[PDB]
Amino acid sequence: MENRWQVMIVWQVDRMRINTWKRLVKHHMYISRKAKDWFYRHHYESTNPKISSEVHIPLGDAKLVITTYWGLHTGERDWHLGQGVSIEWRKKRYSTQVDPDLADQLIHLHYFDCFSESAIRNTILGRIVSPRCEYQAGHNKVGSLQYLALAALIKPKQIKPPLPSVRKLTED
Amino acid sequence: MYVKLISSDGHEFIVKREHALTSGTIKAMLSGPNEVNFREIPSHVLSKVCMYFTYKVRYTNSSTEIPEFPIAPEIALELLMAANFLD
Amino acid sequence: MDVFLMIRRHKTTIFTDAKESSTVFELKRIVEGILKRPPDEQRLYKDDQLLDDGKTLGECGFTSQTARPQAPATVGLAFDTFEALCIEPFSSPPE
Amino acid sequence: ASLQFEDKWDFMRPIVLKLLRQESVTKQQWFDLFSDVHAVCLWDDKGPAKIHQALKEDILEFIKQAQARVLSHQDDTALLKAYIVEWRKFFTQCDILPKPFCQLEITLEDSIVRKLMLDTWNESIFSNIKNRLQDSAMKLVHAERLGEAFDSQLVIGVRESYVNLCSNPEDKLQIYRDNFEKAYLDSTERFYRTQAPSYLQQNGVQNYMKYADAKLKEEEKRALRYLETRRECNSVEALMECCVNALVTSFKETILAECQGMIKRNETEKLHLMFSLMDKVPNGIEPMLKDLEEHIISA
Amino acid sequence: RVVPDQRSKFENEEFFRKLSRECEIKYTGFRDRPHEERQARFQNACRDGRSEIAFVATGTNLSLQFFPASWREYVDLEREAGKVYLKAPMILNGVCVIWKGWIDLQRLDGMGCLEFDEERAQQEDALAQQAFEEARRRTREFEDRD
Numbered sequence A: 001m002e003n004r005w006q007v008m009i010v011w012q013v014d015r016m017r018i019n020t021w022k023r024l025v026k027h028h029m030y031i032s033r034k035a036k037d038w039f040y041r042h043h044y045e046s047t048n049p050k051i052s053s054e055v056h057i058p059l060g061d062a063k064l065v066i067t068t069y070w071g072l073h074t075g076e077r078d079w080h081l082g083q084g085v086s087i088e089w090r091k092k093r094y095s096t097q098v099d100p101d102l103a104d105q106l107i108h109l110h111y112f113d114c115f116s117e118s119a120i121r122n123t124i125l126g127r128i129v130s131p132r133c134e135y136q137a138g139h140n141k142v143g144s145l146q147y148l149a150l151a152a153l154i155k156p157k158q159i160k161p162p163l164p165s166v167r168k169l170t171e172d
Numbered sequence B: 001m002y003v004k005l006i007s008s009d010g011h012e013f014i015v016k017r018e019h020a021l022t023s024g025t026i027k028a029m030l031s032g033p034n035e036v037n038f039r040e041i042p043s044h045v046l047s048k049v050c051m052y053f054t055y056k057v058r059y060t061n062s063s064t065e066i067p068e069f070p071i072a073p074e075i076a077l078e079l080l081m082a083a084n085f086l087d
Numbered sequence C: 001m002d003v004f005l006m007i008r009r010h011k012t013t014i015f016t017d018a019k020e021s022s023t024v025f026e027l028k029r030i031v032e033g034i035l036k037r038p039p040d041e042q043r044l045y046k047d048d049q050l051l052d053d054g055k056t057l058g059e060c061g062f063t064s065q066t067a068r069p070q071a072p073a074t075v076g077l078a079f080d081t082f083e084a085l086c087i088e089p090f091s092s093p094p095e
Numbered sequence D: 001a002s003l004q005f006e007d008k009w010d011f012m013r014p015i016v017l018k019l020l021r022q023e024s025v026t027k028q029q030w031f032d033l034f035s036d037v038h039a040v041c042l043w044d045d046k047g048p049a050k051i052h053q054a055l056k057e058d059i060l061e062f063i064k065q066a067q068a069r070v071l072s073h074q075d076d077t078a079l080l081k082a083y084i085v086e087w088r089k090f091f092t093q094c095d096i097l098p099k100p101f102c103q104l105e106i107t108l109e110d111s112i113v114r115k116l117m118l119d120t121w122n123e124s125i126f127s128n129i130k131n132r133l134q135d136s137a138m139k140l141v142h143a144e145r146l147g148e149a150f151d152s153q154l155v156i157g158v159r160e161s162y163v164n165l166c167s168n169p170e171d172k173l174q175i176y177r178d179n180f181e182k183a184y185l186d187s188t189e190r191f192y193r194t195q196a197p198s199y200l201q202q203n204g205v206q207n208y209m210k211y212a213d214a215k216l217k218e219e220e221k222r223a224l225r226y227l228e229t230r231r232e233c234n235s236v237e238a239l240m241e242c243c244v245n246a247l248v249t250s251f252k253e254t255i256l257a258e259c260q261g262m263i264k265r266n267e268t269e270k271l272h273l274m275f276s277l278m279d280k281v282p283n284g285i286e287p288m289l290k291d292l293e294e295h296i297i298s299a
Numbered sequence E: 001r002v003v004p005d006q007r008s009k010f011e012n013e014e015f016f017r018k019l020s021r022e023c024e025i026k027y028t029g030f031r032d033r034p035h036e037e038r039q040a041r042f043q044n045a046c047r048d049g050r051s052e053i054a055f056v057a058t059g060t061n062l063s064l065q066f067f068p069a070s071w072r073e074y075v076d077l078e079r080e081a082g083k084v085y086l087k088a089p090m091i092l093n094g095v096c097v098i099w100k101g102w103i104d105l106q107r108l109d110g111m112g113c114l115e116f117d118e119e120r121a122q123q124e125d126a127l128a129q130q131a132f133e134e135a136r137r138r139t140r141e142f143e144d145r146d
């Protein structure tokens, strides 16, 4: 018995950033094969007034939720009030918020195409290789020298229109 | 505290031990029979390798601003091989 | 704000670092720690230009902006009296 | 791109052998070896399973030569000396040899290589002799308790074999616990079950306690040298509990009768010992306490 | 030894280094509205059930939104008069944390930071927490098989 609150960590985005992100996700899930298993949840299904949208991306047994926000009270003097994103990794009534970097790395484990264990040796042997990493967004920290070395040699695949990356949403 | 890694071209490199222990292979070679001798890898390689060692020790701990360790395309194949051996 | 160095004399070279606030002397003492020779016999250069012992590293024109772990600046050293500054280039890659 | 395992292995092979044997090896040999194994794995598709099988074979051949050297001795005890002697080297080798085989690991704690050594060793030499090695050890401890002084390394080596040779992942110390520990313990229970009721009748109760505290000192030390410590096991506490049960608890009634008496005679040095011994017995302390309040009632 | 692992990333890691620093926070309200109104809308939004509260670290591009639960938490003004105190147990990148702070009722200026929360970590779960660590740990390059 007292006011209860649920509290979130929210990174801010410039308005156009959301529109780009939204069009990319909707584009790749429905208009291409790549992101289809992802789910996009509109603003009206969502019980919170402040939720601009959500993208539920299953990773194995646990799922990632990317939440976009509306009419928020941070970052602007404008009438629409401006907005943000938050990200969570959810399994069986457990939650953790996740930062944009890790969000992308985590998405990437389960989704887009990369080098296989064969690729690094085959590159050495001249046997050539498939496939190549798309989604540069998937590699963050620093890198194994091997990975980066390979990276000097094989530039990432470069999809159009680009696949969704949350770091790109939160950049600047 | 320091250990020394040698190039075929006869160049000598001195680097901190904890920096070197980045290399798992080097972590093994140091066991038993300091200083260590590399046959297949040239000097322009071991230099660059020491550079990555430091780069890693520095930016792995604190992720705030992390810059693009630079690698030139011709050095790249030789470097990849060298990395595959050491790491 | 640390700066990162390769000290390169003849074939031998040393990977180390110090603060922008360090003085060339301090470094000559460190080099003494590694190669075991006292800080007289050593003469430290930036390019062809000699370094004053009592002057700070940032004041020799080494800044953390200039010297990065990913890409350190080269120093160079000189060793009965003295020998000319000699820095042995790294092997060249084939065509 | 010219060399794959057929050319290379003949260069690698002698070095495995020096390393298996403790024969001296120079730094450039070791480095060259590292280079060789790695080149073999990168360049040959069949290369790594091949390094594995050849490895397995060479390790068996030398373990077998080792066995040859141990099993020759007919005497039950004089065999053990040679076993221990072979073992110190072999075990140090298990730390040394697997390291150049790291790419072999990456290409496919327990290295497949260290695991392989200790396993090959378990099937080839140890399993046949193990009961015998253990028995000789029980005799050795028996000798030390009686004052015959000897080399610690033998007992330790046998125990080490029992700890480090264990096969199953689910319990690491299981077979060690179920044989060496069980036997060392049974040995304790019977040795002190025999000896204990005697010293009491000879030297009297008060002196019995002084003797008992001491035997506890003796045996806790002995467990520390001979018994598995490093892995932070439960063994020592069990040995200790077992002995306390033997030395103190069996006599718990007979001893305690003295307490009130010594409370009246004001013997403190004696009571310290009583409490010290009893303190280990779980319910041991309380009757001394009740005895004491009861004495406080009349002064 | 799951929680000491958790704590250590809270202690040495840069992400937690910046947030544990006792930074200084402001409340963002209807900024368009003048100061007196804002003082009033804020106190109400705390005392009344439904309003989201926004607090920013002033040094960052990052924000904290307390949403009404309807959409161990607290926003409490009873502790000390002329102030409001704030408690936010969270889980960030797999470490359970608690952000604590206070806000000056007049200034709408305040203070806040992260402290490590052992309780949540002792309590939460084994399989799920662990699964997060297992996953956070790996990176995609070279995992797929040929």
Ligand SMILES: [Zn+2]
Pocket: A113, A114, A115, A133, A134, A135, A136, A138, A139, E140, E141
């Ligand atoms: Zn990738």
